[PDB]
């Protein structure tokens, strides 16, 4: 178990395969984390197409079931991370994996939803497919306090808001922020860079869509209390103020710029 | 790196007295009673005399902890009168103030 | 003549702060104590330990912030919490100030086994109460 | 507009063990500053009244400890400097408050205890007769 | 459109709602789980936003005191009991039941019981030291004609 996990961590995918072969020779049974590491090593070892990778992942899951080894959140998190490499094909089995999580009773965490959102974030139009996933994810997370379970949890909000900025959905951004500002969930905001990017996108979308009065209220509430605005964010705020013909605060913004 | 060799001697005396405090207490308790036989009290006397000279707590001198002044040291602050006056006059000591009544 | 903790007027040119301009007989009347701890109260112990710690803290913050402290420190003790409030000049760069704050806080906390905090109030120059 | 959507309450547990009954707590705060003691008394009184605790306040007579030191360094015995320490007292007498209420109030007023102010709280604890004292052995 | 949490699944796992919850605390602490707890902590890690959170963090680390103040907090006197501190006559087993030695040891035990600073172990050490000293001085005691040894 530990040799496979370490070799996967150090990207010794061929060595991880050799360790898996040695495990099969010894006819021993691994655990859930070992199977997840094996899935990651198999996916990252070769540049095969989606069909081979998905067949191998399904075979590994069936082998884990045969070995009387029970699943965990890490399994589905790694499955989604691996499937992120093949967005076009993996758009379909992502919902199947999520329904498997629901049926087993393994409630998806913030990182699981983040990985699903990233998988649905295929380069191109997000309205076609992300509209079928983001609202359901928000409904599931709505009014739910969370605990740190997976290493990628902290990313979720950032990624979500980013695609929120893509969708130009002020209501969805408000729901995401309310999810962040619910109980202790704010602690999942992530590192300094993630926090800055999240707040920049959020305030940019507010300036783009929200009424200038509530826009100024959010400007007072967040800046500089939450983050220091970027020059582009201030430019967008100036544009929004100019659209709302409220030019009288333009010098004050310049003061704020200073 | 004490203030002077006198403070170093006092530190050595304090450490040695703390080391030998329990043995001295037991032997002296054997001595300071009228119950035990006088011969045992005499051997206890020679035992307590056999202990090193610097282990006696009476040799401990309360010197100022910042200038090694042997006299004029307030026990509460362990400071000489000059250093205590300096610190109080600058106001660095809480509560202490000039007395006028 | 009394020479203790007094600034003697010579030409009316020497700038002095509020602390230096007041003689010791004004401590209870015009300038509160620079340190605040319960050790010197009635029935309280460890006055000498607090005094020694205060002296070390003053001599340590004076040398850790060379030419930066505008006036004498203010030491406050609340439970096991220790707070050093320092008026500092704006000569040094903020990066160095933050580095020194972190370093001094961590080192003092580990040395005295208490959660030391350091609050810096910056002034453009040493505030002059009067000239002597 | 950035108010939290929902806050989390601190975990409060109810233990089947009967609560301690306190007949009287004498929070005697000592300080060097009369104004600081007055402000702390105002704080404690307002907190107790908001928590519905019966509280009285009085001021024990202050203490002034004075000592004398030689003014000069070498020899000026005739000339001395006299220093004094003033310990002013304020006694808050709280009556008929339970163990949990006493604990929470003491924590609230001790976390906000000003620097330079020391506290000596005496808790009169009501107890029933021991099991073995009702009848002889 | 429609709910996406119901429908066809991978259908590989069963409805095993119970994960690996068996107790395995007897094993040595694995480095892997310890380091992964650090990843989880970093996930929940954020800088302090106000003073109350700083106080909470300090209390959790043990730097801060636990109000209301217990002057004896963190101290247990080696888990002793009042009867152990007071009734030290039980340790007076080798000493004679009568005579000057018994009277002196009675005085010593009464003084030790009056002592609120020494621990029970230190009192036992004092009693044992007296026992050994009297055992070493058996010849002098017998010469003085007081029963011992």
Curated annotation (Swiss-Prot), chain A:
<feature type="repeat" description="PPR 5">
    <location>
        <begin position="72"/>
        <end position="108"/>
    </location>
</feature>
<comment type="function">
    <text>Mitochondrial RNA-binding protein that has a role in mitochondrial translation.</text>
</comment>
<comment type="subunit">
    <text>Component of the mitochondrial small ribosomal subunit (mt-SSU). Mature mammalian 55S mitochondrial ribosomes consist of a small (28S) and a large (39S) subunit. The 28S small subunit contains a 12S ribosomal RNA (12S mt-rRNA) and 30 different proteins. The 39S large subunit contains a 16S rRNA (16S mt-rRNA), a copy of mitochondrial valine transfer RNA (mt-tRNA(Val)), which plays an integral structural role, and 52 different proteins. Associated with the 12S mitochondrial rRNA (12S mt-rRNA).</text>
</comment>
<feature type="repeat" description="PPR 3">
    <location>
        <begin position="1"/>
        <end position="30"/>
    </location>
</feature>
<feature type="repeat" description="PPR 7">
    <location>
        <begin position="153"/>
        <end position="187"/>
    </location>
</feature>
<feature type="repeat" description="PPR 8">
    <location>
        <begin position="195"/>
        <end position="229"/>
    </location>
</feature>
<feature type="repeat" description="PPR 4">
    <location>
        <begin position="31"/>
        <end position="71"/>
    </location>
</feature>
<feature type="repeat" description="PPR 9">
    <location>
        <begin position="230"/>
        <end position="258"/>
    </location>
</feature>
<protein>
    <recommendedName>
        <fullName>Small ribosomal subunit protein mS39</fullName>
    </recommendedName>
</protein>
<comment type="similarity">
    <text>Belongs to the mitochondrion-specific ribosomal protein mS39 family.</text>
</comment>
<feature type="repeat" description="PPR 6">
    <location>
        <begin position="109"/>
        <end position="150"/>
    </location>
</feature>
From Swiss-Prot, chain C:
<keyword id="KW-0689">Ribosomal protein</keyword>
<protein>
    <recommendedName>
        <fullName>Small ribosomal subunit protein uS3m</fullName>
    </recommendedName>
</protein>
<dbReference type="GO" id="GO:0005763">
    <property type="term" value="C:mitochondrial small ribosomal subunit"/>
</dbReference>
<keyword id="KW-0496">Mitochondrion</keyword>
<keyword id="KW-0809">Transit peptide</keyword>
<dbReference type="GO" id="GO:0032543">
    <property type="term" value="P:mitochondrial translation"/>
</dbReference>
<dbReference type="GO" id="GO:0003723">
    <property type="term" value="F:RNA binding"/>
</dbReference>
<dbReference type="GO" id="GO:0003735">
    <property type="term" value="F:structural constituent of ribosome"/>
</dbReference>
<keyword id="KW-0687">Ribonucleoprotein</keyword>
<dbReference type="GO" id="GO:0005743">
    <property type="term" value="C:mitochondrial inner membrane"/>
</dbReference>
<comment type="similarity">
    <text>Belongs to the universal ribosomal protein uS3 family.</text>
</comment>
<comment type="subunit">
    <text>Component of the mitochondrial small ribosomal subunit (mt-SSU). Mature mammalian 55S mitochondrial ribosomes consist of a small (28S) and a large (39S) subunit. The 28S small subunit contains a 12S ribosomal RNA (12S mt-rRNA) and 30 different proteins. The 39S large subunit contains a 16S rRNA (16S mt-rRNA), a copy of mitochondrial valine transfer RNA (mt-tRNA(Val)), which plays an integral structural role, and 52 different proteins.</text>
</comment>
UniProtKB/Swiss-Prot annotation, chain D:
<dbReference type="GO" id="GO:0032543">
    <property type="term" value="P:mitochondrial translation"/>
</dbReference>
<dbReference type="GO" id="GO:0005743">
    <property type="term" value="C:mitochondrial inner membrane"/>
</dbReference>
<comment type="subunit">
    <text>Component of the mitochondrial small ribosomal subunit (mt-SSU). Mature mammalian 55S mitochondrial ribosomes consist of a small (28S) and a large (39S) subunit. The 28S small subunit contains a 12S ribosomal RNA (12S mt-rRNA) and 30 different proteins. The 39S large subunit contains a 16S rRNA (16S mt-rRNA), a copy of mitochondrial valine transfer RNA (mt-tRNA(Val)), which plays an integral structural role, and 52 different proteins.</text>
</comment>
<dbReference type="GO" id="GO:0005763">
    <property type="term" value="C:mitochondrial small ribosomal subunit"/>
</dbReference>
<protein>
    <recommendedName>
        <fullName>Small ribosomal subunit protein uS10m</fullName>
    </recommendedName>
</protein>
<keyword id="KW-0689">Ribosomal protein</keyword>
<dbReference type="GO" id="GO:0005739">
    <property type="term" value="C:mitochondrion"/>
</dbReference>
<keyword id="KW-0687">Ribonucleoprotein</keyword>
<keyword id="KW-0496">Mitochondrion</keyword>
<comment type="similarity">
    <text>Belongs to the universal ribosomal protein uS10 family.</text>
</comment>
<dbReference type="GO" id="GO:0005759">
    <property type="term" value="C:mitochondrial matrix"/>
</dbReference>
From Swiss-Prot, chain E:
<comment type="subunit">
    <text>Component of the mitochondrial small ribosomal subunit (mt-SSU). Mature mammalian 55S mitochondrial ribosomes consist of a small (28S) and a large (39S) subunit. The 28S small subunit contains a 12S ribosomal RNA (12S mt-rRNA) and 30 different proteins. The 39S large subunit contains a 16S rRNA (16S mt-rRNA), a copy of mitochondrial valine transfer RNA (mt-tRNA(Val)), which plays an integral structural role, and 52 different proteins.</text>
</comment>
<comment type="similarity">
    <text>Belongs to the mitochondrion-specific ribosomal protein mS31 family.</text>
</comment>
<protein>
    <recommendedName>
        <fullName>Small ribosomal subunit protein mS31</fullName>
    </recommendedName>
</protein>
């Amino acid at each position: 178990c530990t040799m496979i996990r370490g070799m996967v961590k150090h990207r010794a995918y061929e060595q991880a395969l050799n360790l898996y072969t040695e495990l099969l020779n010894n006819r021993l049974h691994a655990d859930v984390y070992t199977f997840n590491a094996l899935i990651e090593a198999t996916v990252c070892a070769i540049n095969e197409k989606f069909e081979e990778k998905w067949s191998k992942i399904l075979e590994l899951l069936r082998h884990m079931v045969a070995q009387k080894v029970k699943p965990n959140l890490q399994t589905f998190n790694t499955i989604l991370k691996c499937l992120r490499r093949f967005h076009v094909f993996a758009r379909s089995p992502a919902l199947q994996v999520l329904r498997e999580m629901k049926a087993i009773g393994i409630e998806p965490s913030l990182a699981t939803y983040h990985h699903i959102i990233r998988l649905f974030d295929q380069p191109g139009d997000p309205l076609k497919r992300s509209s079928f996933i983001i609202y359901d994810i928000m409904n599931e997370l709505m009014g739910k306090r969370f605990s740190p379970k997976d290493p990628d949890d902290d990313k979720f909000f950032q990624s979500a808001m980013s695609i929120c900025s893509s969708l130009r959905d002020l209501e969805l951004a408000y729901q995401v922020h309310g999810l962040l500002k619910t109980g202790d969930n704010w602690k999942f905001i992530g590192p300094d860079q993630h926090r800055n990017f999240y707040y920049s996108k959020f305030f940019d979308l507010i300036c783009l869509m929200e009424q200038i009065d509530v826009t100024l209220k959010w400007y007072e509430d967040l800046i500089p209390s939450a983050y220091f605005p970027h020059s582009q964010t201030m430019i967008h705020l100036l544009q929004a103020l100019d659209v709302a013909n409220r030019l009288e605060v333009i010098p004050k913004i310049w003061k704020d710029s200073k | 790196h004490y203030v002077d060799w006198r403070m170093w001697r006092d530190v050595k005396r304090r450490k040695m007295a703390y080391e030998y405090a329990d043995e001295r207490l037991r032997i002296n308790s054997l001595r300071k009673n009228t119950i035990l036989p006088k011969i045992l009290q005499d051997v206890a006397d020679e035992e307590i005399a056999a202990l090193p000279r610097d282990s006696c707590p009476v040799r401990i001198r309360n010197r100022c902890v910042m200038t090694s002044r042997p006299r004029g040291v307030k026990r509460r602050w362990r400071l000489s009168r000059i250093v205590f006056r300096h610190l109080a006059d600058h106001g660095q000591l809480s509560g202490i103030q000039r007395a006028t009544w | 003549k009394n020479r203790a903790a007094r600034v003697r007027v010579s030409k009316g040119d020497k700038p002095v702060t509020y602390e230096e301009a007041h003689a010791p007989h004004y401590i209870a009347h015009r300038k509160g104590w620079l340190s605040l701890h319960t050790g010197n109260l009635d029935g309280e112990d460890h006055a000498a330990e607090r005094t020694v710690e205060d002296v070390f803290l003053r001599k340590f913050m004076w040398g850790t912030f060379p030419g930066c402290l505008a006036d004498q420190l203010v030491l406050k003790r609340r439970g096991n919490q220790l707070e050093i409030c320092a008026v500092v000049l704006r000569q040094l760069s903020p990066h160095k100030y933050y580095f020194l704050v972190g370093y001094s806080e961590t080192l003092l906390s580990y040395f005295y086994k208490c959660p030391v905090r350091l609050h810096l109030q910056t002034v453009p120059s040493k505030v002059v109460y009067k000239y002597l | 507009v950035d108010v939290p959507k929902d806050l989390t309450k601190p975990v409060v547990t109810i233990s089947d063990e009967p609560d301690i009954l306190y007949k009287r707590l004498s929070v005697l705060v000592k300080g060097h500053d009369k104004a600081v003691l007055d402000s702390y008394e105002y704080f404690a009184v307002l907190a107790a009244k908001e928590l519905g605790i019966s509280i009285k306040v009085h001021e024990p007579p202050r203490k002034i400890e004075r000592f004398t030191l030689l003014q000069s360094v070498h020899i000026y015995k005739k000339h001395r400097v006299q220093y004094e320490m003033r310990t002013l007292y304020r006694c808050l007498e709280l009556e008929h408050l339970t163990g949990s209420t006493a604990d929470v109030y003491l924590e609230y007023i001790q976390r906000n205890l000003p620097e330079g102010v020391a506290m000596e709280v005496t808790k009169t604890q009501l107890e029933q007769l021991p099991e073995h004292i009702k009848e002889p052995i | 459109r429609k709910n996406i949490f119901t429908g066809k699944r991978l259908n590989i796992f069963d409805m095993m709602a119970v994960t690996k919850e068996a107790p395995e605390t007897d094993t040595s602490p694995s480095l892997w789980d310890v380091e992964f707890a650090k990843q989880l902590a970093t996930v929940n890690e954020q800088p302090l936003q106000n003073g109350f959170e700083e106080l909470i963090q300090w209390t959790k680390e043990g730097k801060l005191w636990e109000f209301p103040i217990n002057n004896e907090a963190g101290f247990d006197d080696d888990g002793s009991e009042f009867h152990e501190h007071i009734f030290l006559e039980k340790h007076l087993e080798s000493f004679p039941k009568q005579g000057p030695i018994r009277h002196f040891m009675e005085l010593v035990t009464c003084g030790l019981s009056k002592n609120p600073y020494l621990s029970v172990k230190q009192k036992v050490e004092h009693i044992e030291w007296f026992r050994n000293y009297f055992n070493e001085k058996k010849d002098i005691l017998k010469e003085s004609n007081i029963q011992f040894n």
